[PDB]
Each structure stands twice: as structure tokens, then as C-alpha cells.
Amino acid sequence: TAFRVSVNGYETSNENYVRILSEWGIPLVDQLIHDSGIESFRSGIGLYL
Amino acid sequence: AEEGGENKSERAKQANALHLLLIGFEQNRERINTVQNSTYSMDQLNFS
């Protein structure tokens, strides 16, 4: 993808969670949900029914 | 005193590391946790 998320021990998981999200923001989450495949599942079953 | 030096032999070497490791262990015991491998940084350790 178009992200360079770097995970480091400089901060805790929550602090990295705050830092990582603050660095990039919501657009990173859009890819996360897209990769989850849940949206495709809704279209799949919906298309069939 | 017995060895007359810290790095004068392999036996003395073990004392040298032990002498400095024990000195190191006691000097910086407040920066060391028990089990979990502590992670720090310049900001977290005040290094300029």
C-alpha cells in the first residue's frame, strides 16, 4: 500500500497506537477494513439473495 | 588484589567482567526490570 508504518519499541503498544494513527490517520483504516473482506461478504450474500 | 589486575588472564578476565558487571548491575539497577526486557530511549533516558 501507500503507507510506511514503522513499529518501534520506543513507545508502548497503546502509545504506538496513538502515534501510528496520528501519523497517518483514518485513510490507513480504510485499507484495514477493505482487507478484512467483511464488506465483500455483505455484497456476496446480498447479491445471491 | 589477588590477581594483581583485571585483564591479566582468563581467570582475571572473568573477575573483570564480574567486577564491572556487578558494578554495572548495582550502578544502573534502577534502569533494569526483573523479567521483561525494558525498552527505553533518549527522551525516556534524558540523552541530549
Number of CB atoms found within 10 A of residue B3's CB: 14
**Euclidean distance between CA atoms B46 and B40, whole angstroms:** 10
CA angle A37–A41–A44, rounded 5-degree value: 135
Q: Which of B36, B38, B39 to mutate to test the interface with A (most CBs of A within 10 A)?
A: B39
- List C-alpha distances in Å: B26 to A25, A33, B16, B23, B45: 44, 50, 15, 5, 18
Size of interface A-B (CB pairs under 8 A): 4
Going by C-beta distance under 8 Å and a sequence separation of 6 or more, which residues neighbour residue B15? B3, B6
Helix orientation angle between A26-36 and A38-48, rounded to the nearest 10 degrees: 50
**Among candidate residues B47, B31, B43, the one with its CA nearest the CA of residue A19:** B43
Nearest-by-CA chain B residue for A12: B39
Experimental resolution (Å): 4.1
Going by C-beta distance under 8 Å and a sequence separation of 6 or more, which residues neighbour residue B41? A10
